[PDB]
Design an enzyme around this catalytic site. Structure first.
Site, short mmCIF file in Angstrom:
data_model
loop_
_atom_site.label_atom_id
_atom_site.label_comp_id
_atom_site.label_asym_id
_atom_site.label_seq_id
_atom_site.Cartn_x
_atom_site.Cartn_y
_atom_site.Cartn_z
N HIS A 1 9.47 -25.86 3.80
CA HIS A 1 9.33 -24.87 2.74
C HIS A 1 9.33 -23.44 3.31
O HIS A 1 9.31 -22.48 2.56
CB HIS A 1 8.03 -25.18 1.94
CG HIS A 1 8.07 -24.85 0.48
ND1 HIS A 1 9.19 -24.99 -0.31
CD2 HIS A 1 7.07 -24.46 -0.36
CE1 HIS A 1 8.89 -24.67 -1.56
NE2 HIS A 1 7.61 -24.34 -1.61
N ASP B 1 14.52 -22.64 0.93
CA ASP B 1 14.80 -24.05 1.09
C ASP B 1 15.41 -24.63 -0.19
O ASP B 1 15.03 -24.27 -1.25
CB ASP B 1 13.56 -24.84 1.50
CG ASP B 1 12.38 -24.56 0.62
OD1 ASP B 1 12.00 -23.44 0.56
OD2 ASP B 1 11.86 -25.46 0.06
N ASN C 1 3.54 -19.75 -3.92
CA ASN C 1 3.51 -19.56 -5.37
C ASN C 1 3.13 -18.16 -5.88
O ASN C 1 3.11 -17.94 -7.08
CB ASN C 1 2.63 -20.61 -6.05
CG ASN C 1 1.16 -20.41 -5.76
OD1 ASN C 1 0.79 -20.01 -4.66
ND2 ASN C 1 0.31 -20.68 -6.76
N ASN D 1 8.38 -23.08 -6.48
CA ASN D 1 7.37 -22.15 -6.96
C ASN D 1 7.45 -20.71 -6.43
O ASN D 1 6.95 -19.83 -7.02
CB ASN D 1 5.96 -22.72 -6.79
CG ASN D 1 5.72 -23.93 -7.65
OD1 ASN D 1 6.38 -24.13 -8.62
ND2 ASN D 1 4.77 -24.72 -7.28
C1 LIG Z 1 -0.24 -29.48 -1.51
O1 LIG Z 1 -0.98 -28.30 -1.15
C2 LIG Z 1 -0.38 -27.08 -1.14
C3 LIG Z 1 -0.60 -26.17 -0.12
C4 LIG Z 1 0.04 -24.93 -0.13
C5 LIG Z 1 0.90 -24.61 -1.17
C6 LIG Z 1 1.56 -23.25 -1.14
C7 LIG Z 1 2.78 -23.06 -2.06
N1 LIG Z 1 2.28 -22.53 -3.30
C8 LIG Z 1 3.76 -24.27 -2.12
O2 LIG Z 1 3.81 -24.63 -0.97
N2 LIG Z 1 4.36 -24.82 -3.29
C9 LIG Z 1 5.08 -26.06 -3.74
C10 LIG Z 1 6.47 -25.93 -4.44
O3 LIG Z 1 7.06 -24.64 -4.35
C11 LIG Z 1 7.35 -26.92 -3.67
N3 LIG Z 1 8.60 -27.33 -4.34
C12 LIG Z 1 9.88 -26.91 -4.05
N4 LIG Z 1 10.74 -27.53 -4.89
C13 LIG Z 1 10.06 -28.34 -5.68
C14 LIG Z 1 10.29 -29.27 -6.80
N5 LIG Z 1 11.51 -29.58 -7.35
N6 LIG Z 1 9.22 -29.88 -7.33
C15 LIG Z 1 7.98 -29.68 -6.91
N7 LIG Z 1 7.67 -28.85 -5.92
C16 LIG Z 1 8.64 -28.19 -5.29
O4 LIG Z 1 6.45 -27.97 -3.33
C17 LIG Z 1 5.36 -27.22 -2.75
C18 LIG Z 1 4.15 -28.12 -2.49
O5 LIG Z 1 3.83 -28.89 -3.66
C19 LIG Z 1 1.12 -25.52 -2.19
C20 LIG Z 1 0.48 -26.75 -2.17
#
Ligand SMILES: COc1ccc(C[C@H](N)C(=O)N[C@H]2[C@@H](O)[C@H](n3cnc4c(N)ncnc43)O[C@@H]2CO)cc1
Length: 194
Positions: A22, A95, A70, A116
């Protein structure tokens, strides 16, 4: 046509997230800064690392938000807002699940696709999606429930090398991208094979 004034590389901050899928966009901007001899300065005002260089008599800025992914929009809007940079002059590297490692493509506008970072940027720019995107393929795990763990994981070295390769292809069309000649950038980039 419209010169790019801001290139944003998306990622999460801290050692835990470094080298994770990511952070592909952040990696592109770091590679770009290094190749251009540009320092990335920590600047709280812009909620990230900011670099600047000159191209054809105009300042081009590099931004890696240090928000969590996010909230990337907070960083992009702070910098674009301050310097009055329209979405058309912004390139966001990120990504892309829908393309395998080794593939990069360019796209103008569209949705976030559950990314996000893209989602927050679209909102923070005043619900404007007409910025350009550098889509760096990271592959897809094969089901929706695996996506979160997958993008926050470190890829196998083979996939990382393929990502490195796609980043190099993209840097190869930097002249076109900086000038805003997306048709040419696309023609050159989308014809490359990792
Ligand atoms: C699990 O614990 C965490 C830790 C940090 C973060 C930071 C950030 N906000 C993120 O990483 N975001 C998301 C989304 O941006 C990303 N993502 C990218 N494409 C996606 C999709 N089609 N569906 C879901 N998530 C997606 O998955 C990541 C992790 O769930 C987030 C979660």
């Amino acid at each position: 046509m419209t010169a790019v004034q801001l290139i944003v590389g998306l990622g999460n901050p801290g050692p835990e997230y470094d080298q994770t899928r990511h952070n592909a966009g952040a990696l592109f901007v770091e590679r770009l800064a290094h190749a251009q001899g540009v320092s990335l300065v920590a600047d709280r005002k812009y909620f990230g690392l900011v670099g600047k260089f000159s191209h054809q008599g105009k300042d081009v800025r590099l931004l890696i938000p240090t928000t969590y992914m996010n909230r990337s929009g907070q960083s992009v809007a702070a910098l674009a807002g301050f310097f009055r940079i329209a979405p058309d002059a912004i390139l966001v590297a990120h990504d892309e699940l829908d393309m395998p490692p080794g593939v990069a493509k360019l796209k103008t506008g569209g949705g976030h696709g559950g990314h996000n970072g893209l989602r927050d940027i679209i909102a923070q720019l005043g619900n404007q999606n007409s910025f350009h995107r550098l889509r760096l393929g990271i592959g897809h795990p094969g089901h929706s429930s695996l996506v979160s763990g997958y993008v926050l994981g470190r890829a196998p070295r083979s996939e990382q090398e393929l990502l490195d390769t796609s980043i190099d292809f993209a840097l190869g069309v930097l002249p076109e991208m900086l000038a805003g000649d997306w048709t040419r950038a696309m023609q050159k980039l989308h014809s490359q094979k990792a």
